[PDB]
Design a protein around this ligand. Structure first.
Ligand SMILES: NC(=O)c1ccc[n+]([C@@H]2O[C@H](COP(=O)([O-])OP(=O)(O)OC[C@H]3O[C@@H](n4cnc5c(N)ncnc54)[C@H](OP(=O)(O)O)[C@@H]3O)[C@@H](O)[C@H]2O)c1
Length: 738
């Protein structure tokens, strides 16, 4: 019997799931589809990491590992909702919540003894992007379905106006970064390699004892110079200061050492260098680590009195006299860009800024132009290109702009997403080599200094072949041209270009428009096509998959959540991600304090539809196909009637939107002529929901406008949460009536 695995994650999509999962079960049941919820929240992965601190009834199965195993089975069907890639501050808050709820888990040891070392290494498995590289055992097919795009045309979202006199720009390192020192090769034979450091002292230091590589694999060695980074930060801060432009920092602190986000910490320390020069000793003696953001500092600071503490505060603020204005995460609560490494994440933050007309919030609460610092230049030039494009051509127009589907290479922890266990902080000056364990042959070499970050990346041949095949597939299906975003001046992408040229001859590409251009040129070409209403498929790497699928859909649709995101698993299974965005922690706020969830579940709906249709196609379950068809049509009706959630408290939210979806779905099922008994089963529900529409709607807007308790954040209580998320007794009783 068919099983759909439905992920329980964190925050907004979690709450939405508390309001929607009962609906899904009530619809999947008549079709003999089991709905199996899998808790992969941060709290859950924590508990699953530490069972030897837990009781009998407290313990939790390693659900992530289970899903991992499931990815290798043909009959697997996963609805993946966005989940938190926890930073250390978030991990800490979560741990606090658990312990306070009586789960007595060990504290996180920032500075460890030898047991606490081990528990830190264990807690590392709960840090950063721990889910997606496991689940993503196929390449990415992301695109906006035509009904969604047409809704976007009929009801354009707010788009910030772009000034030709905008001073907004991207500052990135022009030397000393991963890009500049990158080296790359394609293996001709299977090899086993070692990442080691030839210290100038003569001593060899091994950082990675063994990395198995396959024939045809593309590997890269890259490093970021600490000297170059810190100098870069200094010069950019001074430029921003002199020009009077607001400083912002846009990085992925999780694609780095999640325990030691060096790129972030250095920015913080250099910004406040005048303060840090005066309290270095006390900060060290306090265990201060601004790699986990300025927040960390503040925490360690609280134990102090208010004489040498307010002196610190005064020094930190004194630093603002010589440093530029600083972009804010929350102007109301005084949350700056430096507060936490995870607040401002490049993939979401840059598009947000571009959508705003090149602007972010300063301390005063106003939108201003910004120097958007993306230290790593590898994938940030494209942002400067689209920014100059907006400065020149004004903001985009969702009513007329074309679309940019993405075919993303990500299968088997491809590239930088798989380099978590091959990323090191260089301990001392010397030569960083990748050597054959058998021959001792140096495959790749870099000259590195102490404090540098050295990374090895791998992308395997089979995912590349499937990536090209998916590109061609999508080109032939959609009739859109395909553009491979590959910079031949980047060694990795050059190797990939060889791959693509080779594998394009393994498919009928006759009458297909398939080109390869550099990332910047590809971005430019794509925009020039966009403003003309022309479509272009972006066939890209993993990072670019992330970046572009946040950027373009936000411009086109207001949010990347309204996207179709299908991962055809290598083993034949299916994963369907509910959009391309994250867990939207800002929505949780408005919910807990105003009982309005502005989370759009359209991504869940689309993903679910694709899932049902695929189950139907694979198993020959006609009823599954019927659920697919009827759900897609019901989504069409949801869009036609603009029953999407509103931002405003007191107006339609996630729950009412879900209700309308249920209604339309029921109607579509009562109207179909393929399964009479099914039509009969859903006729009753359809009539009940259609009859009591105003009653249920009213029941859903009643509760709106008042603070609400879900009994937690990282581990909210199921019953309280379900009490809040399903407050319509009428609706609930209608669903319970089967
Ligand atoms: N695939 C994944 O699992 C995945 C991917 C990316 C990020 N994440 C995680 O998500 C967390 C937060 O990421 P972030 O704050 O950088 O970006 P984000 O979660 O995408 O949220 C940024 C903004 O996008 C809009 N948005 C996102 N999803 C929406 C939806 N379903 N309906 C309506 N609007 C939506 C919201 O804007 P408004 O405030 O204007 O409504 C939201 O504040 C991070 O911890 C990150 O690790 C997970």
């Amino acid at each position: 019997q068919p099983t759909i695995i439905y992920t329980l994650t964190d925050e907004a999509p979690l709450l939405a799931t508390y309001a929607f999962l009962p609906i899904v079960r009530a619809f999947a049941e008549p079709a003999g589809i089991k709905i199996e919820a899998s808790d992969i929240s941060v709290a859950a992965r924590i508990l699953a990491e530490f069972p030897d601190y837990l009781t009998e009834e407290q313990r939790v199965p390693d659900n992530l590992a289970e899903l991992g195993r499931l990815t290798q089975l043909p009959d697997t069907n996963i609805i993946k909702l966005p989940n938190i890639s926890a930073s250390v501050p978030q991990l800490v808050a979560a741990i606090k919540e658990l312990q306070d709820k009586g789960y007595a888990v060990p504290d996180y040891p920032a500075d460890p003894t030898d047991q606490e070392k081990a528990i830190k290494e264990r807690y590392a498995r709960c840090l950063g992007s721990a889910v997606n590289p496991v689940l993503r055992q196929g390449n990415s097919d992301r695109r906006a379905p035509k009904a969604v795009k047409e809704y976007a045309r009929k009801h354009p979202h707010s788009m910030g106006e772009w000034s030709m006199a905008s001073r907004t720009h991207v500052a990135h390192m022009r030397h000393g970064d991963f890009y500049a020192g990158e080296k790359s090769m394609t293996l001709d034979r299977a090899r086993n390699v070692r990442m080691e450091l030839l210290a100038k002292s003569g001593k060899t230091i091994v950082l990675k004892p063994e990395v198995p590589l396959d024939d045809g694999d593309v590997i890269d060695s890259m490093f970021m110079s600490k000297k170059a980074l810190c100098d870069f930060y200094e010069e950019q801060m001074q430029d921003a200061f002199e020009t009077g432009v607001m400083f912002s920092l846009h990085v992925k602190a999780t694609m780095m050492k999640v325990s030691h986000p060096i790129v972030f910490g250095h920015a913080v320390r250099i910004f406040y260098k005048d303060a840090f020069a005066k309290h270095q000793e006390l900060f060290d003696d306090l265990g201060v680590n601004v790699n986990n953001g300025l927040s960390d500092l503040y925490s360690k600071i609280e134990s102090l009195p208010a004489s040498q503490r307010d002196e610190i505060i005064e020094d930190l603020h004194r630093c603002h006299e010589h440093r530029p204005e600083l972009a804010m995460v929350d102007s109301a609560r005084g949350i700056s860009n430096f507060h936490s490494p995870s607040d401002v994440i490049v993939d979401a933050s840059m598009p947000a800024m571009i959508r705003a007309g090149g602007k972010m919030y300063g301390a005063d609460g106003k939108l201003k132009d910004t120097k958007a610092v993306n230290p790593e230049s590898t994938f940030s030039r494209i942002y400067q290109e689209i920014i100059n494009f907006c400065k020149t051509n004004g903001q985009f127009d969702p009513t007329t702009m074309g679309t940019v589907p993405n075919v993303g290479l990500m299968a088997q922890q491809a590239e930088e997403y798989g380099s978590h266990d091959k990323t090191f902080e260089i301990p001392e000056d010397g030569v960083a080599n990748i050597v054959d364990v058998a021959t001792g042959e140096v495959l790749l070499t870099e000259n590195v200094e102490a404090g540098d970050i050295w990374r090895m990346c791998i992308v395997k041949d089979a995912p590349i072949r499937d990536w090209v095949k998916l590109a061609v597939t999508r080109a032939r299906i959609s009739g859109m041209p395909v553009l491979f975003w590959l910079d031949p001046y980047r060694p990795h992408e050059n190797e990939l270009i060889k791959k693509v040229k080779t594998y394009l001859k393994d498919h009928d590409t006759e009458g297909l428009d398939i080109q390869i251009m550099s990332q910047v040129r590809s971005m430019r070409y794509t925009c020039e096509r966009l403003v003309r209403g022309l479509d272009t498929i972006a066939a890209t790497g993993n990072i670019l998959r992330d970046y572009l699928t946040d950027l373009f859909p936000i411009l086109e649709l207001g949010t990347s959540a309204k996207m179709l995101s299908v991962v055809p698993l290598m083993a034949g299974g299916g994963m369907y991600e509910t959009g391309a965005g994250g867990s939207a922690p800002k929505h949780v706020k408005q919910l807990v304090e105003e009982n309005h969830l502005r989370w759009d579940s359209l991504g869940e709906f689309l993903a679910l539809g694709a899932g049902f249709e695929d189950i139907g196609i694979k198993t020959g379950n006609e009823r599954a196909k019927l659920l697919g068809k009827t759900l897609d049509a019901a989504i069409g009706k949801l869009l036609d009637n603009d029953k999407s959630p509103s931002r405003k408290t007191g107006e339609l939210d996630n729950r009412g939107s879900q209700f309308y979806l249920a209604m339309y779905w029921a109607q579509e099922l009562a109207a179909q002529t393929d399964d009479q008994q099914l039509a009969e089963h859903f006729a009753s529900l359809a009539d009940v929901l259609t009859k009591n529409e105003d009653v249920i709607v009213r029941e859903l807007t009643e509760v709106q406008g008042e603070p609400v308790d879900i009994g937690g954040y990282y581990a909210p209580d199921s019953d309280m949460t379900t009490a809040v998320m399903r407050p319509s007794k009428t609706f609930n009783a209608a669903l319970e009536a089967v």
